[PDB]
Amino acid sequence: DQQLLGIWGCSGKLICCTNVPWNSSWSNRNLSEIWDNMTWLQWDKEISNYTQIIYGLLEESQNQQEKNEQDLLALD
Amino acid sequence: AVGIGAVFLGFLGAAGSTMGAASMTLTVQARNLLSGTVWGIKQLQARVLAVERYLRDQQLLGIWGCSGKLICCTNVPWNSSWSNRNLSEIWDNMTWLQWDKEISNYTQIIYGLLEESQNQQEKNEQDLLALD
Amino acid sequence: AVGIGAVFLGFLGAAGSTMGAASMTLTVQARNLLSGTVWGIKQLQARVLAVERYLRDQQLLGIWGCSGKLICCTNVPWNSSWSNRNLSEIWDNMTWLQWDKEISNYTQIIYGLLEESQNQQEKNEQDLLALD
Amino acid sequence: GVLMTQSPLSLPVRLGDQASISCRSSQSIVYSNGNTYLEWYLQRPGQSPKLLIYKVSNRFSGVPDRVSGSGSGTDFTLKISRVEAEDLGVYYCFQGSHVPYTFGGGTKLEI
Amino acid sequence: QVQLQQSGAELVRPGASVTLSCKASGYTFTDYEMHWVKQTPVHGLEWIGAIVPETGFTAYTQKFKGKAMLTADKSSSTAYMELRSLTSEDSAVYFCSRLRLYWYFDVWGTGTTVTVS
Amino acid sequence: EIVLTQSPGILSLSPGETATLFCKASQGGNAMTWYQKRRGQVPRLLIYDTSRRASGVPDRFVGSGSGTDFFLTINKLDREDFAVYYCQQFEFFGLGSELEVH
Amino acid sequence: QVQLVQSGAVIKTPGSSVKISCRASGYNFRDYSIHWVRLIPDKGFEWIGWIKPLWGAVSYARQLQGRVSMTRQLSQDPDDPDWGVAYMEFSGLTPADTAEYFCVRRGSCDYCGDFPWQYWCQGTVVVVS
Amino acid sequence: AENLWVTVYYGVPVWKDAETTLFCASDAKAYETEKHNVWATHACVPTDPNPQEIHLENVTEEFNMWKNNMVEQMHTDIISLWDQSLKPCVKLTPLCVTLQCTNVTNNITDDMRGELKNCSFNMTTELRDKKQKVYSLFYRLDVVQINSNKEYRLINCNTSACTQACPKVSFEPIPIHYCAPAGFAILKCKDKKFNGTGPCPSVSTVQCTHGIKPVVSTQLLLNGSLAEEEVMIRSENITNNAKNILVQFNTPVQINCTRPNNNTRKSIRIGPGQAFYATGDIIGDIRQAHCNVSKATWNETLGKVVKQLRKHFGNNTIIRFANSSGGDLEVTTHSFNCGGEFFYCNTSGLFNSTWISNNDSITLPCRIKQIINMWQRIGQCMYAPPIQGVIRCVSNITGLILTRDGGSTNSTTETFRPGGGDMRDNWRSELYKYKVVKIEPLGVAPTRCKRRV
Ligand SMILES: *[C@@H]1O[C@H](CO)[C@@H](O[C@@H]2O[C@H](CO)[C@@H](O[C@@H]3O[C@H](CO[C@H]4O[C@H](CO)[C@@H](O)[C@H](O)[C@@H]4O)[C@@H](O)[C@H](O[C@H]4O[C@H](CO)[C@@H](O)[C@H](O)[C@@H]4O)[C@@H]3O)[C@H](O)[C@H]2NC(C)=O)[C@H](O)[C@H]1NC(C)=O
Ligand SMILES: *[C@@H]1O[C@H](CO)[C@@H](O[C@@H]2O[C@H](CO)[C@@H](O[C@@H]3O[C@H](CO)[C@@H](O)[C@H](O[C@H]4O[C@H](CO)[C@@H](O)[C@H](O)[C@@H]4O)[C@@H]3O)[C@H](O)[C@H]2NC(C)=O)[C@H](O)[C@H]1NC(C)=O
Ligand SMILES: *[C@@H]1O[C@H](CO)[C@@H](O[C@@H]2O[C@H](CO)[C@@H](O[C@@H]3O[C@H](CO)[C@@H](O)[C@H](O)[C@@H]3O)[C@H](O)[C@H]2NC(C)=O)[C@H](O)[C@H]1NC(C)=O
Ligand SMILES: *[C@@H]1O[C@H](CO)[C@@H](O[C@@H]2O[C@H](CO)[C@@H](O[C@@H]3O[C@H](CO)[C@@H](O)[C@H](O)[C@@H]3O)[C@H](O)[C@H]2NC(C)=O)[C@H](O)[C@H]1NC(C)=O
Ligand SMILES: *[C@@H]1O[C@H](CO)[C@@H](O[C@@H]2O[C@H](CO)[C@@H](O)[C@H](O)[C@H]2NC(C)=O)[C@H](O)[C@H]1NC(C)=O
Ligand SMILES: *[C@@H]1O[C@H](CO)[C@@H](O[C@@H]2O[C@H](CO)[C@@H](O)[C@H](O)[C@H]2NC(C)=O)[C@H](O)[C@H]1NC(C)=O
Ligand SMILES: *[C@@H]1O[C@H](CO)[C@@H](O[C@@H]2O[C@H](CO)[C@@H](O)[C@H](O)[C@H]2NC(C)=O)[C@H](O)[C@H]1NC(C)=O
Ligand SMILES: *[C@@H]1O[C@H](CO)[C@@H](O[C@@H]2O[C@H](CO)[C@@H](O)[C@H](O)[C@H]2NC(C)=O)[C@H](O)[C@H]1NC(C)=O
Ligand SMILES: *[C@@H]1O[C@H](CO)[C@@H](O[C@@H]2O[C@H](CO)[C@@H](O)[C@H](O)[C@H]2NC(C)=O)[C@H](O)[C@H]1NC(C)=O
Ligand SMILES: *[C@@H]1O[C@H](CO)[C@@H](O[C@@H]2O[C@H](CO)[C@@H](O)[C@H](O)[C@H]2NC(C)=O)[C@H](O)[C@H]1NC(C)=O
Ligand SMILES: *[C@@H]1O[C@H](CO)[C@@H](O[C@@H]2O[C@H](CO)[C@@H](O)[C@H](O)[C@H]2NC(C)=O)[C@H](O)[C@H]1NC(C)=O
Ligand SMILES: *[C@@H]1O[C@H](CO)[C@@H](O)[C@H](O)[C@H]1NC(C)=O
């Protein structure tokens, strides 16, 4: 798990944030209802249909961002 | 000969001096902390106790701000009720063995506060990137 | 069929090409490096040797500047006494196996310099935040 | 190599009867997930070779309901129930497990 | 539009080097693969290898590694061969083609007859 | 089959004057060893395979060579360091050299 | 250490058979081959054959087949596995066969191959009437 | 521009040659019969399917089969696992005892000899007071004469007490897939023409090896791996003779082997929970176990390997074959296990040939020992249990193991002879394709970027 965070942007922050926009095709739900009604056990099943789609997108976003950062430092 | 200053860079050679040895020795003690028919079972459990004890310490830094820096500066103010000493005396007169007993009465007060300060700072930073 | 492009993204698939293949594949070799009655004892000591070997490498990145970036960058200038080569010929004419032997005559000069440069940078950074 | 051994090559097949063209591989063609990628070709003299089946069983889009592939491990047999004049000519095998892929020698359907 | 506009019939004297051209169309090159299959009366269908055109990721067989070269120009949107040491067995019919990843052959071109004489 | 031929064969040298023997092999691509047999005693390997000398061997014996041509240079010899020398490929032997005290 | 002991010299009548027992000790006898070499005066050395004591796999020179034979005896006890015996039986004697015989072992090192020997038995003279 | 700084990339594809342990994994077909049916049903994990046998390009690695590891540990692994399937079974301390033997009922000749001895002996009961008289059948190769009457004893009783194998466990081969743990890789040469030594030009990594079955045989290794197209000989140094010569050919020679005799097992209780499975009566004709091979296929497959052998020795060379030069039993003949019983079968009938530089079958008779002494261990034997009925098995002769006679003195004939010797030369015919490398990531490289403050 520490490795799988290490290949994303979140090193050891324990509350990271990242840069993939949330596709509403999965959730189809309002904001505060998944911040005031649902439990995490209840949140488990609605995202259990699909996994490593999200994780592949995070790997792709970080693998892109490190290359763009190396290109930013390349002219530097 | 090999000389005198070589054992300054050795493992735990810095422990006799004051903090000035500690400000340069810190890679060495961190380095030698990790690398090491029925006897193999006891050496195997001796090895896994070592790596478990290392990874507890990396975790206990990781829940604070100090990720892997090995020198880390955090944001709680020092309460002068504990130390009650001048600045340069605890940075020129004392050793860390001598420092240990003077803070041995009180521990996990500081480790309690350092959880809370980072836990609050991540919330306010989440708010700052939330409005951004 | 599965095609040619799948083995570009396989484990160690980029080893035969130049760096441009290896500039993108770096998550895969990092991934497969970890996940794996007397026979249980022998495979158990194999597993703990594997994870001890991994954690030595995470430690050795920890004492340098880059904690978990996986693409570091740092601040020692490249001494041209070793390379004696043009730029893109070590980006397009060589492989990493071919790059291994040309830096195998000398090692840990670089690993010695990186520790010293990071310790010096932490010292100057501590002075910069100390005046702050 | 993983070269295919075709049996038989020449099959003079009358119109309306069945046909069976088998291949035997040197190794197993099991891809590293479970789905072997087998293919069967067409050929007329003067046309580019095109595909009938792209699996053990599942077929190319546009192929009629007379051609079927079957088999396991190394032995993989094509079976055509009713043979027409379009079926005449050279057929092949094809692998998809790991590169480099090997074609066979060519199996001619005749009359 | 989904086509493989190949080169022409090539009556090549031996010892020469041949630059073939497979102008593929219907999609971008950056989507899917490019492939080359021979046609000899000795073997039937033969192999050259395969190319990925975004980076230039090439593979061949043992029979023709070091003999043929695969290059891909991303701007001109063509394919290429660079044959070396043409022999009498190399007189063949070349079929440019496309694979997708985890799929089959969509398109099959005309077949360039390269005879070595 | 494979013919081995020492050179110069019977030699004549006083003590002190360093020397070099040379034994030609008919076959090529293989690597020889050497032996040192004194007056009526048990023989003794002193160098194996090209240049690797065995145990209990002073380094003043140095052998080398390539192709079909193998040299053995003896330096700083004694009147007791002299003995009969043989060279060996797999089981095949040479007829030997000898360095007469002059 | 490695020790190699042979038997004593012998007068033999022509056309008879001779036996020579090379005894080895100081090493694990089940591992290394035992070779046999002869020294004829005014002929140079000459190879004879080899044996592997694990199963008695033998191999002989071509110009002496049918005449020579080899056996071995292992040590069968859990206390002294080291000592081993090799026997040579040599028949069809001529007066040209009067010579000196040696039993040898391969050198113990890893990179030294099959033939370059290290240790030598003290040699046995065989003399034919 | 020329002020290049350095970066350390982690996870760079690069390796070294190293040596480590491995990990076995067996297929699910061997788990369908369970509970100590064959060995390593508990010692190995069940396999993951279809390992990631992917390719690699522009790459060349020198290999070796001769100074290769992972065969040096397998000869330790199979022996160490072989010992584990014996210690839960019976010891034969009470059976080393005086025997009273006689010939079996048969028309016996004066010149030729029988091969079965009917022996009676005292034995204990379950109780300690009473004793019993009981009889069995034995072979000539297991009794010696202790010295009117003629009384025998067992052969191995003056060196070691013996272990009966439990009749529930079997010795049949099963597929074994070795696997490398995390942080290693297994490379595989995929070349056609490749003599096993020197650089392979087309490597391919893999997660686990393919099917590796363990057999036991000295000459004429069985159920092996087939060659791709041609017939390949392999050796370390062919001008040397002290190393064996592995010959691997393409078309497998079918071999039938049988014992036509019909047995009966007979349980003798030695004590509490003890069962000595002796041989009961023989029903029918006392016959000799033998094997058959086809004449024409063998005459063909020698014709292939002579054409292959003439590449290293000049075209004008006489090649001939001969019986084995001698030694102990199970290196002159060839041995195998056929459904739980060990044969030793004379192979003079194959290697009787010469080759000039221009419906029937072959029978060959066998012998059956009951106690084995495999790997020539000082404190070991294994009484095998007799099995019921007429027994036969069918196999594929696939490779040979040869040895040149290294004679001096001006030879055109270059004779070849079989020979088993070490068991490891069986194994090197199976693991010659692979090698084990060790991933060392964290390379280092100059580039043009500078980390800021
Ligand atoms: C080289 O490779 C070949 C190919 O595998 C091996 O040949 C096989 O050898 C095994 C063991 O020697 C054979 O297995 C045995 O088969 C016997 C015959 O039974 C078959 O046929 C009956 C009738 O249809 C079926 O009911 C049955 O399922 C079999 O298909 C069995 O009787 C044997 O079982 C006996 O042993 C078990 C052990 O637990 C006892 O519990 C049983 O009660 C019974 O007594 C056993 O299953 C196999 O048949 C061979 N294959 C073929 C095609 O014949 C060679 O052995 C191998 N070479 C070497 C040297 O090992
Ligand atoms: C029988 O044949 C085999 C293979 O054909 C042969 O094995 C090889 O022998 C050589 C010795 O010549 C081994 O040593 C190597 O040799 C190469 C050059 O050939 C060098 O890279 C190394 O040795 C060099 O360095 C030494 C340092 O002083 C020098 O003394 C030496 O002369 C060389 O300059 C390297 O060690 C080689 O390893 C093996 N091959 C394998 C795969 O192991 C074998 O020697 C032949 N049998 C006999 C008795 O010669
Ligand atoms: C091995 O030797 C034993 C020696 O005891 C043989 O056992 C005995 O065999 C004889 C025949 O040779 C049996 O005698 C017969 O008994 C039947 C029924 O009792 C009787 O009708 C006959 O007239 C004759 O007397 C005897 O019973 C038998 N004893 C035992 C304890 O089995 C045994 O047959 C020999 N085995 C072989 C394979 O030859
Ligand atoms: C290879 O072939 C040769 C030629 O036949 C075999 O040599 C022969 O071996 C047999 C058995 O060793 C000899 O038989 C004799 O048997 C009697 C029985 O008592 C014994 O007293 C004799 O002393 C001898 O052993 C036979 O004489 C012998 N041939 C010659 C010409 O001497 C050889 O055994 C074969 N190799 C193998 C491994 O079988
Ligand atoms: C039982 O077997 C023994 C040994 O095989 C027989 O004793 C001799 O056997 C040899 C070879 O079989 C014959 O040449 C001798 O003539 C036998 N000696 C005698 C005195 O016969 C013995 O004959 C066999 N039969 C019996 C009833 O004891
Ligand atoms: C089994 O044990 C019996 C009991 O001792 C043995 O019978 C004796 O054998 C000896 C020696 O042959 C004779 O001196 C005795 O006279 C025998 N006892 C009787 C009562 O006659 C017998 O020999 C043993 N072996 C077998 C095979 O039965
Ligand atoms: C196995 O093949 C390799 C190369 O294919 C052989 O190595 C070369 O052999 C030639 C002649 O046989 C020598 O001239 C070279 O010097 C060898 N090169 C090296 C690097 O060894 C090797 O000899 C072959 N071995 C056998 C037993 O056939
Ligand atoms: C070997 O001997 C056994 C002795 O039992 C034979 O088994 C018998 O076979 C016959 C023939 O069908 C049956 O009628 C009997 O019932 C069987 N006996 C038992 C106890 O089951 C067996 O057939 C023999 N082997 C061969 C090949 O004939
Ligand atoms: C080994 O035994 C097998 C037993 O099946 C033989 O296979 C069959 O043998 C018969 C002979 O009567 C043939 O008529 C069959 O056609 C064979 N079966 C097949 C599938 O070919 C095999 O021939 C024997 N081999 C030898 C060398 O004797
Ligand atoms: C292996 O088979 C051969 C072929 O029969 C056996 O050789 C024969 O042995 C007998 C004596 O036992 C001689 O009379 C024959 O002359 C031999 N035949 C030939 C062609 O020489 C040989 O004995 C068998 N092996 C064993 C160990 O017995
Ligand atoms: C021995 O090798 C032969 C190769 O000819 C094997 O025979 C073929 O095996 C495959 C796979 O099991 C079958 O699909 C073929 O039908 C077999 N051919 C024939 C003619 O039988 C055989 O399986 C191998 N093993 C044994 C025990 O014979
Ligand atoms: C066991 O007995 C046999 C038969 O005489 C003999 O050859 C062997 O040497 C004996 N074992 C020992 C260790 O003496």
Side-chain angles (χ1 to χ4, degrees), chain A residues 2-4 6-8 11 59 62-63 66-67 70 73, chain C residues 23-24 27 30-32 34 54 67-71 73:
Chain A
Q2 286 292 323
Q3 183 185 8
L4 196 148
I7 58 172
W8 293 349
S11 67
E59 292 173 355
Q62 185 64 39
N63 198 359
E66 293 178 356
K67 182 174 74 176
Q70 192 271 332
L73 274 71
Chain C
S23 299
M24 287 77 166
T27 178
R31 176 174 291 169
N32 291 317
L34 183 63
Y54 172 72
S67 68
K69 293 180 182 179
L70 186 61
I71 302 293
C73 194

Side-chain angles (χ1 to χ4, degrees), chain G residues 9-13 93-94 97-99 125-129:
Chain G
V10 63
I11 302 283
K12 292 299 291 294
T13 62
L93 289 172
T94 64
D97 294 329
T98 293
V125 182
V126 176
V127 49
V128 176
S129 176

